[PDB]
Design an enzyme around this catalytic site. Structure first.
Site, PDB file in Angstrom:
ATOM      1  CG  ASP A   1     -78.011   3.084  32.567  1.00 24.95           C
ATOM      2  OD1 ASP A   1     -77.330   4.296  32.336  1.00 24.95           O
ATOM      3  OD2 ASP A   1     -77.572   2.041  32.657  1.00 24.95           O
TER       4      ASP A   1
ATOM      5  CD  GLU B   1     -76.821   1.996  41.111  1.00 24.94           C
ATOM      6  OE1 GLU B   1     -76.882   1.032  41.656  1.00 24.94           O
ATOM      7  OE2 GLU B   1     -76.611   2.319  39.968  1.00 24.94           O
TER       8      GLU B   1
HETATM    9  C1  LIG Z   1     -76.296  -7.359  43.050  1.00 26.35           C
HETATM   10  O1  LIG Z   1     -76.013  -6.319  42.356  1.00 26.35           O
HETATM   11  C2  LIG Z   1     -76.075  -5.784  41.013  1.00 26.35           C
HETATM   12  C3  LIG Z   1     -74.697  -5.786  40.249  1.00 26.35           C
HETATM   13  C4  LIG Z   1     -74.060  -5.166  39.163  1.00 26.35           C
HETATM   14  C5  LIG Z   1     -72.974  -4.459  38.971  1.00 26.35           C
HETATM   15  C6  LIG Z   1     -72.498  -3.946  37.874  1.00 26.35           C
HETATM   16  C7  LIG Z   1     -73.427  -3.491  36.837  1.00 26.35           C
HETATM   17  C8  LIG Z   1     -72.666  -2.826  35.605  1.00 26.35           C
HETATM   18  C9  LIG Z   1     -72.175  -1.454  35.604  1.00 26.35           C
HETATM   19  C10 LIG Z   1     -73.284  -0.332  36.518  1.00 26.35           C
HETATM   20  C11 LIG Z   1     -73.196   0.949  36.025  1.00 26.35           C
HETATM   21  C12 LIG Z   1     -73.759   1.992  37.016  1.00 26.35           C
HETATM   22  N1  LIG Z   1     -73.834   3.211  36.564  1.00 26.35           N
HETATM   23  C13 LIG Z   1     -75.146   3.136  35.873  1.00 26.35           C
HETATM   24  C14 LIG Z   1     -75.563   4.821  35.842  1.00 26.35           C
HETATM   25  O2  LIG Z   1     -76.790   4.926  35.293  1.00 26.35           O
HETATM   26  C15 LIG Z   1     -74.467   5.413  35.186  1.00 26.35           C
HETATM   27  O3  LIG Z   1     -75.167   6.828  34.941  1.00 26.35           O
HETATM   28  C16 LIG Z   1     -73.187   5.295  35.993  1.00 26.35           C
HETATM   29  O4  LIG Z   1     -72.386   5.888  35.021  1.00 26.35           O
HETATM   30  C17 LIG Z   1     -72.845   3.730  36.219  1.00 26.35           C
HETATM   31  C18 LIG Z   1     -71.822   3.803  37.205  1.00 26.35           C
HETATM   32  O5  LIG Z   1     -72.172   4.698  38.380  1.00 26.35           O
HETATM   33  C19 LIG Z   1     -74.638  -4.261  36.881  1.00 26.35           C
HETATM   34  C20 LIG Z   1     -75.045  -4.940  38.132  1.00 26.35           C
END
Ligand SMILES: COCCc1ccc(CCCCCN2C[C@H](O)[C@@H](O)[C@H](O)[C@H]2CO)cc1
Length: 765
Positions: free
Chosen positions: A538, A735
């Protein structure tokens, strides 16, 4: 025999508990069909159940943890839920019984044990909610002998085109059932299992919680209308027990109240199978399933030293079961901007402001419906398909059941539009949409995502070159089957390859840029001032400001990853015209990686931009990006550049933490700045690629073999221990992991590529 295997796979995989977004529930791999869901909640007061009831997954102070202890989507599994708020430890055992013509039968046991802190006499409301979608289907609760409810089992009889004839039975259960002495018992009974049968328009059946509460509220209203009041109120648990009204409809609420510990069974019986499924059936198949899970894990995930220990075995079983146990089925419409605006061509300086404007038109519309069968990163926060995530999810899954992985890949490639685009995040259906703010739902046909699925296809191809048990490997054991799959998929792989080159092309020819090839240069579309979401990483530091002149070294290496695969697969299909094209492109990339991305000053790879004075500048941020040609297996084992990268990987003062490789170097000026997502923390997926490439170099004659062997040995240790210690302490896969303290941070229940650890431990790549 291809068609044959396909039908056997369909029949095998059709039923599962494919609703990872909720704690427990079942649906088949059919878009509009029969779904179930479990809800529970202590009741202590007149207002409390609304807050205590559990249904969709979350992670707060209320919930200690939960997840699958064993799971195979062919056979079933056992899930454990540790609920602090509701003072309960819950077990959900689920099991499939093959037979008939309609994807077999299944059974589940729900056991709840009050924990040590719970009142010995706690009152817990349990609901099993059943919906059916489809115009030409029917589902009826057989009415009970008793006046007010059910002394015994609840029988639903149903039929649809998809499932043929079936019966779903919710057993009587074990557990004290509380009894009310109140006046109201003369009208509502003293306390018994009850059923409500309703109909709602099909598209809202998924909203179980509101649908339930509507009924609870209607019951309470009726109390208030019929002179039941505070002069003499019934007990809460009886205020919250529904008036029994079984019948026919597309929604069926089955409600029990227990005092103390409790358990009950669900038995789904495909009529076209043998006899109906019984509770003794359940118990047998559960035990059988464990033996099988056990025996498979030892063969498939044989943990090598120093992890052969029983503690690491439990840990691997947990990380694996949680990863594979997140597999879900999703169905419905997506939100896409099909405008294909000019501003998304990102040809300008300042293109991000243009692109913001195009989005502000709001041309996105729902399209589909689409369906996806896929594993997910996060039951409680993002229970949906993420494109490059699945690349990692499937590596361990393929080990376990290659035919399962090929199914998921197939499911993903069926989404590809005429251009070769797959949205990087699949939000299918209103249910899926409920979890995501309207502002983040829209996909953009110019947004890529690392093609990590090729990595799985890569592993299948090497496996190929060199009944549940049978099916799991039928696509490697039967070469013609393997090949036909690839024959069918190949067109789409190439299409995607072409789509990358069409849409994610860098500008060589328009600037003072010399290089061996005028073709090969890539740049991720989608980048904003501080972010580049599409790349996966990101907020990893990129050229500032973003600029159409950018070239990104990671993207080029992914293209590399694809060509290498197309060559492998092409050669197996003999597309000779094609394989010659691929080689001419591989060659150019290798050269162009050097000419465009290599830094001699800094001794690693870099992104590029073009200057204030319009010349190509390297922009070095020592970190994951910097290692990319290496991570993706593109460098020759004797390369000087490899050696220099090994120096950088090895070097504590840069990337090497006791806990794994840092996303970004401690010496980079952006280390631990801003949101600090990819700007220092340890990420298991990129660490995994590092570990796999080190081991490759370690087990080959060459100059860096023994340094590589050291680093492999130590990295694998550091990554496994870090993920393990954290699992031991917190119960969770995390994560990312903190480079200074080794602590897991951000999201829990990340299984998720953190589970790659099972493959790290088991080695012999
Ligand atoms: C309390 O908790 C906070 C909750 C909260 C929930 C969902 C979100 C949006 C989506 C998050 C994307 C995560 N991630 C990002 C990685 O960089 C990427 O490489 C990957 O593809 C993807 C998934 O694995 C944001 C915040």
């Amino acid at each position: 025999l291809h068609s044959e295997i396909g039908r056997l796979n369909n029949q095998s995989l059709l039923w599962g508990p494919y609703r990872p977004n909720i704690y427990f529930g079942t649906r088949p791999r059919i878009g509009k069909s029969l779904m179930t869901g479990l809800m529970w909640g202590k009741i202590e007061s007149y207002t409390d159940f609304q807050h205590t009831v559990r249904y969709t997954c979350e992670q707060n102070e209320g919930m200690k943890g939960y997840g699958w202890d064993e799971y195979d989507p062919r056979r079933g599994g056992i899930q454990s839920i540790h609920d602090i708020q509701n003072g309960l430890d819950i077990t959900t055992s689920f099991v499939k019984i093959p037979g008939g013509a309609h994807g077999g039968s299944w059974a589940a046991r729900i056991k709840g044990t009050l924990n040590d802190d719970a009142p010995k006499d706690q009152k817990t409301i349990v609901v099993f909610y059943v919906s059916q979608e489809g115009e030409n289907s029917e589902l009826e609760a057989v009415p009970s002998e008793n006046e007010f409810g059910y002394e015994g089992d609840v029988i639903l009889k149903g039929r649809s085109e998809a499932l043929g004839n079936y019966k779903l039975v919710v057993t009587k259960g074990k557990g004290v059932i509380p009894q009310s002495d109140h006046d109201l018992s003369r009208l509502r009974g003293p306390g018994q299992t009850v059923v409500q049968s309703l109909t709602y328009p099909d598209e809202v059946l998924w909203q179980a919680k509101p649908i339930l509460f509507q009924q609870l509220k209607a019951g309470i209203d009726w109390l208030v209308e019929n002179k039941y009041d505070v002069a003499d109120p019934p007990p809460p648990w009886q205020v919250y027990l529904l008036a029994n009204k079984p019948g026919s409809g597309n929604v069926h609420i089955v409600q029990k109240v227990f005092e103390g510990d409790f358990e009950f069974d669900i038995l789904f019986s495909s009529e076209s199978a043998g006899k109906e499924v019984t509770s003794k059936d359940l118990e047998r198949e559960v035990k059988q399933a464990t033996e099988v899970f056990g025996e498979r894990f030892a063969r498939v995930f044989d943990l090598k030293a120093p992890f052969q220990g029983d503690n690491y075995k439990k840990f691997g079983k947990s990380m694996f079961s949680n990863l594979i146990g997140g597999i879900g089925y999703f169905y419905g419409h997506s939100l896409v901007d099909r405008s294909y605006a000019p501003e998304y061509d990102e040809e300008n300086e300042g293109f991000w402001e243009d692109a913001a404007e195009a989005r502000a038109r709001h041309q996105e519309a729902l399209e589909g419906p689409y369906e996806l069968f896929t594993s997910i990163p996060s039951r409680p926060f993002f229970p949906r398909g993420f494109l490059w995530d699945e690349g990692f999810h499937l590596l361990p899954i393929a080990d376990w059941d290659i035919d399962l992985a090929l199914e998921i890949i197939k499911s993903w490639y069926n989404l590809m539009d005429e251009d070769g685009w797959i949205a990087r995040e699949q939000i299918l259906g209103a249910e899926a949409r409920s979890k995501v703010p309207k502002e983040f739902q829209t996909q953009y046909p110019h947004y890529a995502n690392p093609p990590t699925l090729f990595l799985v296809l890569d592993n299948f191809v090497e496996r190929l070159r060199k009944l549940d048990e049978t099916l799991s490997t039928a696509s490697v054991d039967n070469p013609e089957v393997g090949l036909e799959y690839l024959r069918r998929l190949y067109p789409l792989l190439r299409r995607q390859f072409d789509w990358f080159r069409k849409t994610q092309a860098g500008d060589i020819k328009s600037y003072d840029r010399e290089a061996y090839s005028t073709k090969e240069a890539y740049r991720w579309r989608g980048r904003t001032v501080s972010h580049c979401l599409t790349s996966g990483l990101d907020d990893y530091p990129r050229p500032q400001p973003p600029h159409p002149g950018e070239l990104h070294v990671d993207l080029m290496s992914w293209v590399g990853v694809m060509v290498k695969s197309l060559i492998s697969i092409g050669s197996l299909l003999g597309a000779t015209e094609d394989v010659e094209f691929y080689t001419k492109v591989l060659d150019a990339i290798e050269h162009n990686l050097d000419d465009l991305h290599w830094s001699e000053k800094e001794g690693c790879y870099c992104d590029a931009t073009i200057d204030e004075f319009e010349e190509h500048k390297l922009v070095c941020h020592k970190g994951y990006i910097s290692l990319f040609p290496f991570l993706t297996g593109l460098l020759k084992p004797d390369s000087p550049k490899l050696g220099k990268l090994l120096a950088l990987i090895g070097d504590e003062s840069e990337l090497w933490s006791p806990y794994g490789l840092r996303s970004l170097s401690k010496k980079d000026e952006f280390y631990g700045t801003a949101e600090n997502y990819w700007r220092s923390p340890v990420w298991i997926n990129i660490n995994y690629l590092a570990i796999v490439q080190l081991y490759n170099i370690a087990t080959q004659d060459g100059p860096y073999k023994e340094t590589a062997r050291d680093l492999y040995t130590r990295l694998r240790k550091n990554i496994v221990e870090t993920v393990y210690r954290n699992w031991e302490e917190t119960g969770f896969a995390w994560e990312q992991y903190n480079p200074e303290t080794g602590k897991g941070q951000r999201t829990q229940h990340f299984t998720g590529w953190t589970s790659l650890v099972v493959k790290i431990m088991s080695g012999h790549h």
